[PDB]
Each structure stands twice: as structure tokens, then as C-alpha cells.
Prior knowledge:
Chain A is low in regular secondary structure. Chain A has no helix or strand. It is classed as virus.
Amino acid sequence: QVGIPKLEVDHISFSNVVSMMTANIRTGDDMAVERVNPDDVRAINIRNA
Amino acid sequence: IPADELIDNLHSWMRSVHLLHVRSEDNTLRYNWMLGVYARSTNYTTPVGQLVVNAPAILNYSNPQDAFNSVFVALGIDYID
Amino acid sequence: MLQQPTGGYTTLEQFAFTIRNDGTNATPTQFLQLLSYEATENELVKKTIPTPETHLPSARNVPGNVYIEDAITQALFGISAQNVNAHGYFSRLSALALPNTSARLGLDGVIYNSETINIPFYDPAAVANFAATYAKLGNASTPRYRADMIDIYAHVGLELAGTDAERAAGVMPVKRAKFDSWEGSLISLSRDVVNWKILAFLIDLCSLEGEALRAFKTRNRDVFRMMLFIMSTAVAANVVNRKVTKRVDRVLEYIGVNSMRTAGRTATITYDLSRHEFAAKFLQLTFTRWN
């Protein structure tokens, strides 16, 4: 006794649970993240690391 | 080639090779050649060679593997080549 | 507050594992009969399985309550693309491993901090042993702990496709398994086997004793050979489907040998790098308990 998946039968259903999203979860915005320069260029190391 | 030239000439080079080290007291320490002399090659430019400049005592291991382990934890690096 | 008579929660109609196919709903036993296989000559030999490490991760303090059960399945048989999951609230389990704790594990698949009003939960005594073994699944991506994502798979193929005549000797010939299909197939069994209540099974393995363990392993060696098949097509190298006159077969490339990337892409379920470490940590942990 389980639920037969409705996406594969013929006759069309007219009402079902849709996973919505509240006013807390927000998508595609910005972050006021800051930078801090390497201060001096002379003592940087790309060689190995 | 003069068998006298290269015998005198090879000496002239081998003479002038010095690799940074620390004199130790403990009898259970072996100097790490391989990796240590590698640093002297580039010129101590690379960090794995710039680490051995500051504290050269990082090359004095008493147990194999533990030799390299230290030159990783103090770099955050995952592999030297 | 359900209890087990030593028949176990699997000896119940409350939750039963059934695949849907054939226009009606069928039990796993009926399905597997369709899986017919041959040989391609690369001997897949049974290695030994190394014991797990006792240290249990710490359930970092967490308010609210996470659906511990969700993730267990949402990683193994998760169909929809699952992104990196090596991180997460995946070890709140260990907070049940200690003797006197108040935190309870309900039905449906949640982990409550305090038993609340109107919520049916498993027996607090037999959920303890389940934790002292599976909370160990918290450290699945910690370096120097992760299992090996190669050798266990040899163990897996000897299970769903190994005729006993072979397992009794520990060696078998690599097989290529093909059953008859329909439309979605492989993807449809995934969307299906996901909602199964896996916790209703695993709890039984760590409690039920020799009397009702020999009898338990006999009626459920098939519910295991079902969530082991889907978990396998997430590894196989090819999924190309042969054609008869009107019929269609889902030949699967090499069950029991593990590659690194899915044959499905679009046709079947897919794993990820963060999940390869996870499946090896599950498959390793569970086999010692089973076998």
C-alpha cells in the first residue's frame, strides 16, 4: 500500500502539493565582502606553494 | 682529455660546494641530503628552500618520513616535486 | 512508542519496501528474477574488509533538529543532482550513542532534541546500538579516515549477481547484467527506492539476535539486494540498451567493478566526488554488520 506516481498515468489531476519558498530564503544578490591587498608585491610567492 | 686535467679541474669545482646545516650533539640524528641540496640548486628563491634558510635545523631528522612531514605542516602545501 | 518482539520493525506492514513496475506494485523478490547475466573474463576476487575506527565524531552543538534520515538516503540513492555533501549536520547521530540521553529518534526520519507531543518513535534502547555503529559515518570525509573507493565494490557485485556456487569459493567472473525494461527505467527505480524508510531496516541489523538474525537475514537478503542494485548503476561504465524486434533490454556494462564516473549522465542516477567517499564509508560500515 503505497502512492502510485501520478506523472505516468493518463487522466489529468487538478490539484497537488507544490514546494514553494518563503520570504527568508533569497537568491541572486550581493555580498559586501571586503578585500585586503597583499600590501607589498615584492615578497609574493607564485614559484611553488 | 688529459687524465691530469679533470682530476685537478673536478677538484676545483667540488671544493666550492657548501650546503647550509646545523651542527648537532645528539648521536641519533641523520642529515637530510636529497631535499636539502635541492634548495641550494634554485637559490633559496622557492619557499621549500626559503624555509630551510631561516631555520636550517629543519633538516635534522631521527626517523625517515618524519623528515618530510615537517616540511608540509609548516607550509600547508600538499606535495613537493 | 513502537516496540519489537524480536521479529523486528521489518516484520511489520507499517513500512515495507516495494518497487513499482509492471503496471502494478511488486516486492523486490519478483523484480530480481529479470536480471540475467553472462561473463566477460576479468576475475573479480573477494578481498578482505578492514575494520572501522572506533572514534566517534562529536555532534557539534546544534539547536533545532535535522532530519538525520533524509541525508542517509539523499546521498546513497539520491537521484536529483546532489552537490557537495562532504560537509553537513551528518553526525547528530552520536548524540544518541550515550546511555541516558533524552534526544529521541522518531518514525518518518527525524532526530528530536526532546521527545515532543504526539510523535511515534523507535525504542530508546535498540536505537543505541544502531548509533554506536552508524554515528561513525560522521567522519566520512576526514582525511586519514575515509574508506577506499575501489575494493568494497568487489564485495558488492558478489552479492546481487553472485550465484552461491561462486561465493562459497570467494571468486567469480566479471558479469554484464541485463534485464528487460520500460521507459525511464533506472531513474524510475531511484525516485522509487528513495522513500523506503531505511532506518526501519538498519536498526534491526544491530539488535536482533542469533535466533531472529538467521531468520531476519533470510527474509531481507532481498531488500538489501535491491538498494544495492541501484547503488551499483551509479558506478557502471555503460548503460547502452540492446534491441530485439519490439523488446528493449538495459544491458549494464560491468556490475561489481568500480569506475569513477556514471554511465547514466542522463539515462541513470549519478554520483559525485564528495559522494564516492561517502558510498565507500557506508558500504564498508554495513558489510561488517551484515556479513
